[PDB]
Amino acid sequence: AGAGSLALSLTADQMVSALLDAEPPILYSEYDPTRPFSEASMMGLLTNLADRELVHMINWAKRVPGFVDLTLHDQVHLLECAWLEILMIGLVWRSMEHPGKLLFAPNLLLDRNQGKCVEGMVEIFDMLLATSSRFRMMNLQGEEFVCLKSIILLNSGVYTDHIHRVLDKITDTLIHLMAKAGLTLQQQHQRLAQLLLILSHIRHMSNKGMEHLYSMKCKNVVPLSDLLLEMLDAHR
């Protein structure tokens, strides 16, 4: 259960405030690459960055309204299902104002050709770039981005009722943000659908990403953290 939850009594404005307060820091790469990259040094940077991002993603998840009302069991399942989708929406968000490039970190901005270094990486970079460009075109606002990141967390393991009540509250919040920005009812419903449809592309990139991370594992190119090995195991 999650009956009586504070998360359902929140206003849209209070839900946005809670979500903004929860935000993880923007991480730097603890290493600059020597140019050029190998398969091993690229995957090393991304895997290292991802491992550091996961630690903060865990603290974020706990400050997401409704999340901590779940059993520790269900909390584990949702993060296990969502974590790469969450890293990915973050990447495409930070990359919006960097046309043709992926801002992995302020000191790790790559274009698609540096993607070629690793085998099968270029196709996913292109999908990430396209998603980033779609956000840029739609002028995705910070308040909308934190709502979507929360939907991904709550949504990506629900079939993979309280979770439904919290997702409904997050939908009310997005429409609030859109009403407030001066969008007609018609424009609101159309923007909501457009943002949510992008989540199915983010799910897609996450599933391909995971196939790739499991290829890379088998290859033994780069060591993965225990935490990262558990997350992979969760998706077989």
Partner: peptide, 8 residues
């Protein structure tokens, strides 16, 4: 199970 320990 690391995530269980970090989430608690």
């Amino acid at each position: 199970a690391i995530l269980h320990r970090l989430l608690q």
